[PDB]
């Protein structure tokens, strides 16, 4: 109980910043995660023995894909930490526990292929889950690992708190389906601009947690340029493999996913920053003002891609 996790000084300072990069040392990530739970939630939230075996079983069920991997899970969880640490008073005790675990688990057992390709491939998971195919699967893996012996990190919760948190996690994980993001933001946009946003209305919280989950999931666009630049290489590696698999089904893939169309990437990034990222982090800064850095970082990276197009790199 009186065992605290501590980090080297540079990490200890930088980890409180939105643009922290978790680093290339795999074996440091679990201690980084547990140090954030401890500071975001409390030392007493989770039995440390049960928490560690949950973290290690989650790590095990992430695959060796270029992007949707163990480092993405921990990277996204840290972005949720930064948001919770800069909005101290706005969240209950169950939301702080549920959301840090939701993010670590959000891409559990990703194969490196979108819901589109599962549907076109006719993968069994597309028969079982007709919308948010991957995302409902991710939740199912999270509940599986929660029910392995020695893995029930929530064992001290009541029947009803247990059900409240798994419900937080389910909605939290479903929201990471970007197809749901566009509508969800446009409803928060309106609500905020008519001034009907009510953080005591449970259906309004759900929407806001949803807008956070999108923000945290895309947070590699909100890092320093050399980190965002090199993370783009990893995300496109996945897109291009899926493009190749699309061609194998006899379907010309969209340009994003065609590796013969890498010339279009800088322009493709612009549309993404304009169509998705800048709006996500705009509406989040309107709802949670202390999250403004994520917008600024996003804007800086948009400006770096314009400099790639203008042949300045
Ligand atoms: C609506 C639609 C087509 O589904 C969304 N459209 C695109 O995703 C889209 C379109 C064109 N070109 C790239 C696209 N997508 C991305 O670039 C991207 N996507 C994701 C999540 C799967 C989505 C996360 C990060 C991303 N970029 C990035 C990541 N890390 C560092 N730098 C940049
Ligand atoms: Mg996902
Ligand atoms: Zn993700």
From Swiss-Prot:
Active-site residues from the entry: 68
Compartment list: Cytoplasm, Cytosol
Tissue: Abundant in the putamen and caudate nucleus regions of brain and testis, moderately expressed in the thyroid gland, pituitary gland, thalamus and cerebellum.
Binding site for 3',5'-cyclic AMP: 68, 269
Ranges where the PDEase domain occurs: 1-312
Assembly and oligomerization: Homodimer.
Entry's disease: Dyskinesia, limb and orofacial, infantile-onset: An autosomal recessive, early-onset hyperkinetic movement disorder characterized by axial hypotonia, dyskinesia of the limbs and trunk, orofacial dyskinesia, drooling, and dysarthria. The severity of the hyperkinesis is variable.
Name of protein: cAMP and cAMP-inhibited cGMP 3',5'-cyclic phosphodiesterase 10A
Recorded name of the encoding gene: PDE10A
């Amino acid at each position: 109980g009186l065992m605290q996790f501590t980090l080297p000084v540079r990490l200890c300072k930088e980890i409180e910043l939105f643009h922290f990069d978790i680093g290339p040392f795999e074996n440091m990530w679990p201690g980084i995660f547990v140090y954030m739970v401890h500071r975001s939630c409390g030392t007493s939230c989770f039995e440390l023995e049960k928490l560690c075996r949950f973290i290690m079983s989650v790590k095990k069920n992430y695959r060796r894909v270029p992007y949707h991997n163990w480092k993405h899970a921990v990277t996204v969880a840290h972005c949720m930490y930064a948001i919770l640490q800069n909005n101290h008073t706005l969240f209950t005790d169950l939301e702080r526990k549920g959301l840090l675990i939701a993010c670590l688990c959000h891409d559990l057992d990703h194969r490196g292929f979108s819901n589109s390709y599962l549907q076109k491939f006719d993968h069994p998971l597309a028969a079982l889950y007709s919308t948010s195919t991957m995302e409902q699967h991710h939740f199912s893996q999270t509940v599986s690992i929660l029910q392995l012996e020695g893995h029930n990190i929530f064992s001290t919760l009541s029947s009803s708190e247990y059900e409240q948190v798994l419900e937080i996690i389910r909605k939290a994980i479903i929201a990471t389906d970007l197809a749901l993001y566009f509508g969800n933001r446009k409803q928060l946009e309106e609500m905020y601009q008519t001034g009907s946003l009510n953080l005591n209305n449970q259906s309004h919280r759900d929407r806001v947690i949803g807008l956070m989950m999108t923000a945290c999931d895309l947070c590699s666009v909100t890092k320093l340029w050399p980190v965002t630049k090199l993370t783009a290489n990893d995300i496109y590696a996945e897109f291009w493999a899926e493009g190749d698999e699309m061609k194998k089904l006899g379907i010309q893939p969209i340009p994003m996913m065609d590796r013969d169309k890498k010339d279009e990437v800088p322009q493709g990034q612009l549309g993404f920053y304009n169509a998705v990222a800048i709006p996500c982090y705009t509406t989040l800064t309107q709802i949670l003002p202390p999250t403004e850095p994520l917008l600024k970082a996003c804007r800086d990276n948009l400006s770096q891609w314009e400099k790639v197009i203008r042949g300045e790199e």
